């Protein structure tokens, strides 16, 4: 809710090229901080955020080991799945997993998360109560049967409610200046004429954090929601994000159009307009 930590696992089989590749990335809100690529020079976890750098070599070593094990556990899983679906040992297949804990104002866990997928489609998901499972197709039921007999559900609940939250709180503190300080968007309206009667008003928002932002065009107070062209929030490349909303206006009516910016890094929602230079 207030914050959250997530990991993204990706295990793919490389028939004819090599062993199943396993990659894992770690996130705390909209910030990545770690990476493990079993197909690297020396399989070891690497930092992707300044605040995780302060961790001892011990941390990296343990992570590397956990991943070196998980990398192997997945090798089997990949094979087992080809089995279930009767797939041949000549095509690629991908097992993707995403788990994490949502921190709530109560300090403790607000919601546990564990979603697993196969070849892009849903396979199995741990239910909200951190005890049940939801199988997509029959094959998932086979795995469900195992994971229940293996009491994985119990172990995961323990992890999310505890160690997950504990480590998350730590990360938020360690990178407090970033993970806990919102970066408001730098905006401006660009205007380029398409003809001698129409021009494009493009409302810009750059360098903000988190990615959650909303910006829309209006005229006289009435929304242009249907006429607004939006781009998906793309990463600027330095941990902050970019996004823009464009709309075509009749040369003359410009000033009736206003852009409205909403982002938690803004004490009050911005209301922009184009200004001739």
């Amino acid at each position: 809710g207030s914050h959250s930590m997530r990991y993204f696992y990706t295990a793919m089989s490389r028939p004819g090229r090599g062993e199943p590749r396993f990659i894992a990335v770690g996130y705390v809100d909209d910030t990545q901080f770690v990476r493990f690529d079993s197909d690297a020079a020396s399989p070891r976890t690497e930092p992707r955020a300044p605040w995780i750098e302060q961790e001892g070599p011990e941390y990296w070593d343990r992570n590397t080991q956990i991943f070196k094990t998980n990398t192997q556990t997945y090798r089997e899983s990949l094979r087992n799945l080809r089995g279930y679906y009767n797939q041949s040992e000549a095509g690629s297949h991908i097992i993707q997993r995403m788990y994490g804990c949502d921190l709530g104002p109560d300090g403790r866990l607000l919601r546990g998360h564990d979603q697993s997928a196969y070849d892009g489609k849903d396979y199995i998901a741990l239910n909200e109560d951190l005890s049940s499972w939801t199988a997509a197709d029959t094959a998932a039921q086979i795995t469900q049967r195992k994971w229940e007999a293996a009491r994985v559900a119990e172990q995961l609940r323990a992890y999310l409610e505890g160690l997950c939250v504990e480590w998350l709180r730590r990360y938020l503190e360690n990178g407090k200046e970033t993970l806990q300080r919102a970066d408001p968007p730098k905006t401006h309206v660009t205007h380029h004429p398409v003809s001698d009667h129409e021009a494009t008003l493009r409302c810009w928002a750059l360098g903000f954090y988190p990615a959650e932002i909303t910006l829309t065009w209006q005229r006289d107070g009435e929304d242009q929601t249907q006429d607004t062209e939006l781009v998906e929030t793309r990463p600027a490349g330095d941990r902050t994000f970019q996004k823009w909303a464009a709309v075509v206006v009749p040369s003359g009516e410009e000033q009736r159009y206003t852009c409205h910016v909403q982002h938690e890094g803004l004490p009050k929602p911005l209301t922009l307009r184009w200004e001739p230079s």
């Binding site: 990991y7 894992a24 770690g26 941390y59 343990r62 992570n63 956990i66 991943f67 094990t69 998980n70 556990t73 997945y74 089997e76 899983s77 087992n80 799945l81 097992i95 697993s116 396979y123 795995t143 195992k146 994971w147 293996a150 994985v152 172990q155 995961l156 992890y159 160690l163 480590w167």
Partner: peptide, 9 residues
């Protein structure tokens, strides 16, 4: 810190 996955699918 990621948990140790010891059970396959």
């Amino acid at each position: 810190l990621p948990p140790l996955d010891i059970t396959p699918y």
